[PDB]
């Protein structure tokens, strides 16, 4: 019952496309004007942990809310049971879940299956109901087979400290909150055939600190489950 930094492994994988975009990046080729969040050095697609925060921040605020019904209008209006992971200016807290960045791990297998350009240009269209005129566009998204790693940590009780159960159900609140996102969109152009992701191999461990015995396999239960 001392210190613990529960590190979380796993591999996310796009099943559909993914168009989490960067606005005005500097890719400079053409209709990469709707780019993806790339690496600046390797120019490989990546995923900010802000979005993996800012989707599980959003899509648990309306799942822990929208049942308690009070709409949680601001990212401090959210209850403690979300923001004690995600952080608040109310209690000044540092979060408790460092959602890390992740980038393109298996670029090697994507050259093994012959996938050529790593970013496929999924065309779309605009039809106006009176003119029936086709207004095209060149929207761009990642290859739907690529896979990114998954890394979050979770600091233990520090402040006179969250007890054993507060580790359990709050970690279970992540796995409850994660399977939502698996059945939800993630990237840009939601609701329209993009941004669906698949999660796998999500386990807990004691990367550092004196993690306990009973309070680990309960945390390897649901996150390995969902």
């Amino acid at each position: 019952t001392g210190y613990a930094k529960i590190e979380i492994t796993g591999t996310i994988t796009v099943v559909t496309g993914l168009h989490i975009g960067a606005g005005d990046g500097f890719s400079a080729i053409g209709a990469v004007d709707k780019p993806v969040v790339r690496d600046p050095l390797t120019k490989w697609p990546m995923i900010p942990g802000t979005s993996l925060k800012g989707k599980v921040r959003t899509l648990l605020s309306r799942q822990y809310g929208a049942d308690t019904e009070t709409f949680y209008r601001k990212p401090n209006d959210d209850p403690a049971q979300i923001r004690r992971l995600f952080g608040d200016t109310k209690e000044y807290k540092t979060g408790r879940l460092v959602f890390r960045d992740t980038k393109l791990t298996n670029k090697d297998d994507l050259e093994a299956r012959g996938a050529k350009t790593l970013t496929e240009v999924k065309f779309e269209n605009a039809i106006n109901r009176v003119t029936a005129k086709a207004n095209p566009r060149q929207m761009e998204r990642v290859i739907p087979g690529s896979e990114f790693a998954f890394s979050l940590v979770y600091e233990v009780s520090f402040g006179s400290l969250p007890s054993s159960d507060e580790i359990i159900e709050d970690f279970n609140a992540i796995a409850r909150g994660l399977k939502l996102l698996e059945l939800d969109y993630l990237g840009g152009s939601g609701t329209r055939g993009y941004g669906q992701v698949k999660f796998s191999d999500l386990k807990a461990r004691a990367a550092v600190g004196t993690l306990d015995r009973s309070l680990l396999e309960m945390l390897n239960h649901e996150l390995a489950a969902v």
């Binding site: 080729i29 053409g30 209709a31 990469v32 390797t42 120019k43 490989w44 970013t119 240009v121």
Partner: protein
């Protein structure tokens, strides 16, 4: 002068219909892969090619002439700018390869520039 002479040929190709018949949308398969080449050409430390990549400048090379024949503006644009010859003498090293990835970059930015090209 390779980073300027892409201007007198981006002028030199003619349009009389009012609009430029070579659309910039006409090259989204040549220039979605030439990015992916450029992203790992520069990550290469050696002066010569990697063995897994001299086919890549060949695999791109037929896609130039395949999309050349599939259209009529690209049919004359490529050899007038001479990308067959600059790809013919490129197989040695990345000395002429990164000239090529900025010769096309000199030509896509000019073709964006000499058009109205609303976006």
């Amino acid at each position: 002068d390779y980073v300027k002479q892409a201007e007198q040929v981006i002028r030199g190709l003619p349009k009389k219909n009012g609009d430029f018949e070579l659309t910039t949308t006409q090259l989204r398969v040549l220039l979605s892969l030439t990015a992916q080449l450029f992203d790992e050409a520069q990550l290469s430390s050696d002066q010569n090619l990697s063995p897994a990549l001299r086919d890549k400048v060949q695999y791109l090379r037929v896609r130039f002439v395949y999309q050349a024949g599939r259209e009529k503006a690209v049919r004359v644009f490529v050899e007038r700018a001479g990308l067959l010859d600059e790809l013919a003498q490129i197989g040695d090293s990345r000395d002429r390869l990164l000239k090529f990835c900025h010769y096309m970059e000199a030509l896509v930015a000019y073709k964006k520039f000499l058009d109205p090209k609303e976006t």
